Amino acid sequence: VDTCSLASPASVCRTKHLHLRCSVDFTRRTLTGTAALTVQSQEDNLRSLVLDTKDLTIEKVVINGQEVKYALGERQSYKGSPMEISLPIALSKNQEIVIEISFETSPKSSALQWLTPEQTSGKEHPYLFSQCQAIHCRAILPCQDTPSVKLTYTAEVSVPKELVALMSAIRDGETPDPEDPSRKIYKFIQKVPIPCYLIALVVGALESRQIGPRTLVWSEKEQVEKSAYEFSETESMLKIAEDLGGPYVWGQYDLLVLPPSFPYGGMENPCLTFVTPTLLAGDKSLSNVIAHEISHSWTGNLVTNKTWDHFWLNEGHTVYLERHICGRLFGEKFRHFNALGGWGELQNSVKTFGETHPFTKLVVDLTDIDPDVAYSSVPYEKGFALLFYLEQLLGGPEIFLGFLKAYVEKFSYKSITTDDWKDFLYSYFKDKVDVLNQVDWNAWLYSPGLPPIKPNYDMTLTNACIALSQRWITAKEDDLNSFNATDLKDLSSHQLNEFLAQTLQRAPLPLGHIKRMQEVYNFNAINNSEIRFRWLRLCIQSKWEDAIPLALKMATEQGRMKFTRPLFKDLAAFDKSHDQAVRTYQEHKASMHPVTAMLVGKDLKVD
Numbered sequence: 098v099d100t101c102s103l104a105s106p107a108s109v110c111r112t113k114h115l116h117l118r119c120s121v122d123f124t125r126r127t128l129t130g131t132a133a134l135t136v137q138s139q140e141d142n143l144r145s146l147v148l149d150t151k152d153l154t155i156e157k158v159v160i161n162g163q164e165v166k167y168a169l170g171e172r173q174s175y176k177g178s179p180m181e182i183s184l185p186i187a188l189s190k191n192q193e194i195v196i197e198i199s200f201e202t203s204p205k206s207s208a209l210q211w212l213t214p215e216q217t218s219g220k221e222h223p224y225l226f227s228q229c230q231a232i233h234c235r236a237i238l239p240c241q242d243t244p245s246v247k248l249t250y251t252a253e254v255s256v257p258k259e260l261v262a263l264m265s266a267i268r269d270g271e272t273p274d275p276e277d278p279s280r281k282i283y284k285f286i287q288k289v290p291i292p293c294y295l296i297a298l299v300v301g302a303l304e305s306r307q308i309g310p311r312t313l314v315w316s317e318k319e320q321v322e323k324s325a326y327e328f329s330e331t332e333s334m335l336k337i338a339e340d341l342g343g344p345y346v347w348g349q350y351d352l353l354v355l356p357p358s359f360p361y362g363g364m365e366n367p368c369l370t371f372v373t374p375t376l377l378a379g380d381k382s383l384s385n386v387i388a389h390e391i392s393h394s395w396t397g398n399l400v401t402n403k404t405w406d407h408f409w410l411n412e413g414h415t416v417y418l419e420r421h422i423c424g425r426l427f428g429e430k431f432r433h434f435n436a437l438g439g440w441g442e443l444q445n446s447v448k449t450f451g452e453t454h455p456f457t458k459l460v461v462d463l464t465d466i467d468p469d470v471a472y473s474s475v476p477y478e479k480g481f482a483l484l485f486y487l488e489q490l491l492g493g494p495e496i497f498l499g500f501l502k503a504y505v506e507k508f509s510y511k512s513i514t515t516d517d518w519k520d521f522l523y524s525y526f527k528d529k530v531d532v533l534n535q536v537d538w539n540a541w542l543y544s545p546g547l548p549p550i551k552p553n554y555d556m557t558l559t560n561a562c563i564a565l566s567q568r569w570i571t572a573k574e575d576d577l578n579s580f581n582a583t584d585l586k587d588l589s590s591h592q593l594n595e596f597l598a599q600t601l602q603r604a605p606l607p608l609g610h611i612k613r614m615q616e617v618y619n620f621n622a623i624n625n626s627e628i629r630f631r632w633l634r635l636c637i638q639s640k641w642e643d644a645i646p647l648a649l650k651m652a653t654e655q656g657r658m659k660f661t662r663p664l665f666k667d668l669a670a671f672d673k674s675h676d677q678a679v680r681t682y683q684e685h686k687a688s689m690h691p692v693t694a695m696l697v698g699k700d701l702k703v704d
């Protein structure tokens with residue numbers, strides 16, 4: 098059972114198909130139209146069913162050409178309101194009907210951000226984008242909002258004719274809107290069954306550039322050239338991912354570069370990966386995010402978590418594939434470097450939450466938890482750490498990659514639990530069950546804190562980062578003039594980032610050390626979002642008042658939660674910036690992504 102959904106479960110009925118016909122009204126900030134659900138009964142004598150909704154206005158429900166009775170339940174906080182629908186005729190098992198629901202969204206839909214022209218690159222046209230993961234699809238349309246149900250979809254979206262709509266689907270044509278010659282209808286088809294959290298919509302002044310045989314990049318015109326260069330490795334990464342996972346089944350692999358308020362690094366919407374413009378470093382150094390989103394085309398989008406309690410299956414296996422793509426491109430020492438960095442991120446999460454915190458468990462119970470509040474790097478890194486540990490236990494990456502490809506083939510088009518994964522692991526590795534029974538499964542899956550065993554990591558690329566970090570931490574005032582711009586000459590951007598991450602783990606440093614770092618390394622000049630984020634955190638935690646305007650600016654000019662949340666929390670914890678942090682949040686709140694706004698508010702204890 099999915100405790101995050103109020104809808105009828107998959108054991109009662111299953112949505113097979115959605116046909117969405119809607120109009121994007123920028124004056125009212127509403128999506129209006131019809132969701133036609135093809136629903137299959139899984140039981141005899143089915144006479145009603147329940148859908149998820151959140152802040153939706155329901156005009157009517159039509160089955161077999163007549164209006165039918167429906168009722169909205171009391172709202173259950175972040176889960177929304179259940180919508181019970183009375184069927185005109187009882188269904189037998191496996192019988193299908195089409196339920197056509199006329200609805201409108203709220204301007205406050207947690208799924209959507211509406212941008213004014215002033216909030217866009219071009220400043221002439223407004224912009225809309227969605228983000229449904231985990232349980233925001235119910236804030237766009239009525240649905241069984243649970244990843245335990247997979248459906249195909251078709252859509253027709255009416256927008257102002259000057260704008261472009263795109264969806265997590267194959268583009269299926271465009272025509273003038275016959276109801277309104279000021280509007281255009283864009284059509285879409287998703288023929289591969291997906292969980293509804295993968296439904297996505299953007300509407301804006303978008304342009305495209307081809308960057309590979311199956312890849313267009315989409316953005317406002319101002320970002321197209323930079324994006325095309327940044328993500329030029331995409332086709333090479335797809336070919337490697339196909340080698341690891343089997344055939345890419347989705348047709349197109351397009352990229353959309355969102356406005357800076359996009360809350361995540363990326364979102365694996367099928368046929369149209371959404372990415373943060375904070376990837377645009379100018380040197381392709383943040384392209385692991387593209388490898389991650391590509392890998393989701395197998396782990397997450399083909400094999401799906403049955404409930405959000407099992408989200409680690411999606412992210413652990415995806416980080417595992419991501420790091421294999423980066424390892425095939427840049428070498429095994431690089432794969433180990435990234436793996437060991439992820440262990441450090443896991444150490445940070447466990448230290449921040451506390452070692453008994455339930456959000457440090459690999460399998461969680463989200464019954465009365467807002468999934469957006471639970472979100473962290475734990476399922477990513479504790480998930481990856483379990484798979485990397487099993488890789489080493491079971492005979493190395495070639496052997497474990499055989500398991501991963503077999504796993505994707507076994508569970509393609511299905512939704513699974515941790516127990517399904519573990520049973521298949523045991524079946525695949527039948528000749529190594531003795532080894533598998535050495536694993537402390539209870540600790541790994543269900544205990545808080547750091548995992549009970551740390552994998553073995555190659556140190557080759559990490560050594561220079563630790564050595565420089567240790568020189569600065571152990572430095573006294575009389576050692577500061579020994580540091581020089583030459584300290585960095587043999588370090589990649591990745592190694593610079595890891596130097597800063599190592600150093601930030603020991604923050605604060607003395608203010609004179611941080612000022613000297615700026616004097617010799619000029620980190621204030623670096624635009625790479627990952628490096629700048631860690632540098633500004635180091636400066637604020639080390640109480641450098643000169644960094645306050647830089648950190649406020651980075652926290653507000655983009656909205657990737659990875660950066661915005663810790664920067665706000667650091668500025669709130671520094672007495673010199675505390676009031677500015679709160680005031681800046683209050684001033685920007687109305688312009689922010691609704692989920693980011695909610696979480697920054699909770700972080701700052703500002704209601």
Ligand SMILES: Nc1nc(-c2ccc(Cc3ccccc3)cc2)c[se]1
Nearest residue numbers: 231408456458459468471472475476
């Ligand atoms: N620690 C652990 N946390 C999880 C965990 C954390 C968040 C979610 C919900 C979610 C997913 C994606 C985007 C937004 C919200 C589910 C599971 C598993 Se183990």
Ligand SMILES: [Yb+3]
Nearest residue numbers: 141142188189
């Ligand atoms: Yb019957």
Ligand SMILES: [Yb+3]
Nearest residue numbers: 268269270286
């Ligand atoms: Yb077509």
Ligand SMILES: [Yb+3]
Nearest residue numbers: 520521523524
């Ligand atoms: Yb078994």
Ligand SMILES: [Zn+2]
Nearest residue numbers: 389393412415
């Ligand atoms: Zn992911």
